[PDB]
Symmetry: C3
Subunit: 262 residues, 3 copies
């Protein structure tokens, strides 16, 4: 039928509790992580919350909490949607669970931008737009029928590997500048970027529409954990990196000022 054997549209009303629970929990996690990040950025500069200043926190210091909070709002909307599936058995009109990877568009162009701004990686906009385009091909690979979904997957994967290589090069060409104390958080966010991301593309090969190992319910459940790790946990490592840099900057400024007085 319209709903494939392994879809959430074949599940009966009353059997969606797991999905609502997972999505509410992830909404809370993402929103609260983003709220901690927001508090940390507002409260102060470095690890010891040094008073910001007249201009306040930079506007890019809000990109990171921003994504986490927005993804949490998205997940709350998804859980509201899943609750309609539990009752009415037929979703909402505004369902963020209908189009797969449609929310990942926004989130990704915002995260790659974050990384590229914080680490001062070059071609910030280039990278961010490339990822938006590769995550538009991702949506397509879920909607487009069999033979052509694999052709589209090929294009998307080629570009993903190309952009990944270029990104790797950029981070490794900024390693010299990045202090060793701040590199821990960077390498952790990179690890999240090079392992965690390829996971999204490989889970495709075992998905409900491709193979059929993971049914749509469980695919959705797994993409929630992956979002906690991207979005939320990526931002906590990037928040850490930022704070380390800002504490080291405070230290450097204070030392420069000591030498200025002396």
């Amino acid at each position: 039928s319209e709903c494939c054997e392994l879809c959430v549209c074949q599940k009966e009303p009353g059997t969606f509790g797991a999905l609502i629970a997972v999505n509410t929990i992830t909404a809370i996690i993402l929103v609260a992580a983003g709220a901690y990040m927001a508090w940390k950025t507002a409260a102060g500069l470095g690890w010891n919350t040094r008073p910001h200043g007249p201009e306040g926190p930079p506007e890019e210091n809000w990109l990171s909490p921003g994504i986490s909070i927005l993804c949490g709002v998205m997940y709350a909307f998804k859980a509201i949607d899943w609750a309609s599936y539990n009752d009415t058995g037929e979703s909402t009109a505004f369902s963020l669970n209908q189009v797969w990877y449609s929310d990942y568009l926004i989130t990704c162009p915002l995260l790659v931008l974050d990384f590229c701004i914080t680490v001062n990686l070059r071609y910030k906009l280039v990278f961010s737009s490339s990822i938006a385009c590769l995550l538009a091909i991702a949506v397509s690979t879920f909607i487009v029928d069999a033979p052509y979904r694999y052709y589209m997957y090929g294009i998307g994967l080629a570009g993903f590997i190309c952009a990944g290589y270029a990104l790797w090069n950029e981070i490794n060409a900024q390693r010299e500048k990045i202090p060793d104390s701040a590199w821990w958080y960077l390498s952790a966010g990179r690890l999240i970027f090079f392992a965690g991301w390829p996971f999204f593309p490989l889970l495709w090969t075992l998905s409900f529409h491709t193979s059929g190992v993971i049914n749509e319910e469980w695919y959705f459940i797994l993409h929630a954990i992956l979002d906690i790790l991207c979005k939320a946990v990526f931002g906590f490592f990037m928040l850490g990196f930022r704070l380390e840099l800002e504490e080291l900057d405070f230290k450097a400024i204070e030392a420069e000022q000591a030498k200025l007085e002396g």
Copy 2:
């Protein structure tokens, strides 16, 4: 049926004259207001149209006329759409009247940005993106079915109140800088922002889909007046503010130059 009792889809062909008229009138108003604003910005700097310069009017001086003109084009498209409802009785393919608050997305992210640029309010992009996201929840609250539209409304209203509080704080933390002559126009645009906006959210509670006091025809008619007051009249007050600032700046420059010669 698909069309609720109090909808424009239940109205017979030939009974849409009022809607076409209102929407054409508002199109004219918004476009002409934006054109006056455009002329004023191009012609000169302050109230006495002081010759601009080599670079010309700043690109942000076009955000304000821009929105008004675009909303007027939107309303012209809406009136064309309403004319098809008057004749064919079944709308156009490209109807800006189908999805409610879908046009408000663009207009709002552009207006909050305007305010934040002109008054130099901090977190410009943050505020603008927050409003875009809260006006995406607004569209949802019109499409999503009963129980879940109120859950979504709750999220939207929470964020609206949060962003409103934050905005209020920002404007009041910039009051010291803003000259008293320019504050008149600011307080008027703020009044339009804190009263006029909450009106949009309260009319929801009495709308065709929520309660049923205001049928979709009249809801549409009221949202046209509200757009004249937001968009058009908001920009005339903001244009006024800008011009006041620019005239005071011209005065300050001329005084500084007199002291430079002396």
Copy 3:
């Protein structure tokens, strides 16, 4: 029926080879042109590929290759879509051939921006957003029914003529600055802009939905050539302009440095 007499939906499975071929060829052309442009921008500054520097190529030097490559990816997706029409006889779920001029949105706001950045034309964002809005009216004129498609066409054409006039003025008010060596490429990209663009609007008058001279198959075939000329060939002239400017800049810097040493 839903498909008009002169549409690609009336063509039988197996008769789409021409469309696939044209769209694959254009995909290759656009991608390869954009890749040459990308190589040229990365490799060096001017015509003689002068080593760039620490910061590398400006982020706007990627807007031009970018569009060409993205339009090539779009056309590859279109050819994949056309192959489904050749086999299944009913398109893909993600068809870039469904909505007419929907891809032109992105491409156009990116190209006008390019021109305005490279030639330092004023009102860059204004122009780019105007074109995005006029190319949203373009999509409408393909979907909206008879009487109202001509009303929308009128609005779109009025704005197109207005924006065209304003653009002409801007380029002619920057002619004095632009060196004569670089003007060749500029006038060629302008020629592509003032002739080539009006072609898009005039082909509308003879299209499958308006008149019926050009059926949708051949309209699609012609819009592919027009994209090679816009996108691809526009960027090769703009790449040329950029390179000329950069070689002249290198020359000027080297002369200034000779005088600095002397």
